[PDB]
Design an enzyme around this catalytic site. Structure first.
Site, PDB file in Angstrom:
ATOM      1  NE  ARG A 114      45.840 -55.211  29.123  1.00  0.00           N
ATOM      2  CZ  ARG A 114      44.744 -54.516  29.580  1.00  0.00           C
ATOM      3  NH1 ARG A 114      43.636 -54.152  28.519  1.00  0.00           N
ATOM      4  NH2 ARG A 114      44.404 -54.242  30.907  1.00  0.00           N
TER       5      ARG A 114
ATOM      6  NE  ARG B 195      41.357 -47.644  24.222  1.00  0.00           N
ATOM      7  CZ  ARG B 195      40.722 -47.012  23.159  1.00  0.00           C
ATOM      8  NH1 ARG B 195      41.140 -46.098  22.351  1.00  0.00           N
ATOM      9  NH2 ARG B 195      39.488 -47.460  23.187  1.00  0.00           N
TER      10      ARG B 195
ATOM     11  CG  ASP C 171      39.932 -51.045  24.002  1.00  0.00           C
ATOM     12  OD1 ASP C 171      39.803 -52.376  24.489  1.00  0.00           O
ATOM     13  OD2 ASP C 171      38.980 -50.165  24.689  1.00  0.00           O
TER      14      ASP C 171
ATOM     15  CG  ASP D 224      36.346 -53.554  24.048  1.00  0.00           C
ATOM     16  OD1 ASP D 224      36.907 -53.945  24.854  1.00  0.00           O
ATOM     17  OD2 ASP D 224      36.371 -52.113  24.003  1.00  0.00           O
TER      18      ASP D 224
HETATM   19 MG   LIG Z   1      36.934 -50.535  25.462  1.00  0.00          MG
HETATM   20 MG   LIG Z   2      38.620 -53.194  26.457  1.00  0.00          MG
END
Ligand SMILES: [Mg+2]
Ligand SMILES: [Mg+2]
Ligand SMILES: [Cl-]
Ligand SMILES: [Cl-]
Ligand SMILES: [Mg+2]
Length: 158
Positions: free
Chosen positions: A82, A92, A95, A97
């Site tokens: 980030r 990015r 990430d 999740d």
């Molecule tokens: Mg994601």
């Molecule tokens: Mg995410």
């Protein structure tokens, strides 16, 4: 409880980023990495030549509460990645999740499980199917059945 976590990267050497993330996840307290998937390559949508993403899934046995696990995954993302606000709408660095947390169904402003739209995301379902081929979603749907009924091309390995 087994938590299934998706990992994605398309910046700053994804193979390095995913490996750094695995180390960080493995270190979360009262948690243990059960299984890690292979690494999959996810091309960008659109003619634009953006970097491919590396996508993976991990099975993490944990005694943490779901929101406690989220505290750690968000922490790892903020510490490792980030870097730029633009990462929100584009490529990015990292990430993480939380896809599933045992058979829990959670709907809070912080945390939604199963992860939003995950049944429509091949870059989540393929690595998930590799590590948990007999997985059943909280609503009773088999993961294998989803992959027999929804339009996903098979992602190549990284
Ligand atoms: Mg994601
Ligand atoms: Mg995410
Ligand atoms: Cl590489
Ligand atoms: Cl579900
Ligand atoms: Mg430990």
């Amino acid at each position: 409880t087994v938590a299934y976590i998706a990992i994605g990267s398309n910046l700053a050497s994804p193979l390095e980023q995913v490996n750094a993330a695995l180390k960080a996840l493995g270190d979360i307290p009262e948690s243990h990495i059960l299984t890690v998937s292979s690494f999959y390559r996810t091309p960008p949508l659109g003619p634009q030549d953006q970097p491919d993403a590396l996508n993976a899934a991990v099975a993490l046995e944990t005694s943490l509460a779901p929101e406690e696990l989220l505290n750690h995954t968000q922490r790892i993302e903020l510490q490792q990645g980030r870097v730029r606000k633009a990462e929100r709408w584009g490529p990015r660095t990292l990430d993480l999740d939380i896809m599933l947390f045992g058979n829990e169904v959670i709907n809070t402003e912080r945390l939604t499980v199963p992860h939003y739209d995950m049944k429509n995301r091949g870059f989540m379902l393929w690595p998930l199917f590799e590590i948990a081929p007999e997985l059943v979603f909280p609503d009773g749907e088999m993961l294998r059945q989803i992959l027999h009924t929804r339009a996903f091309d098979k992602l190549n390995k990284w």
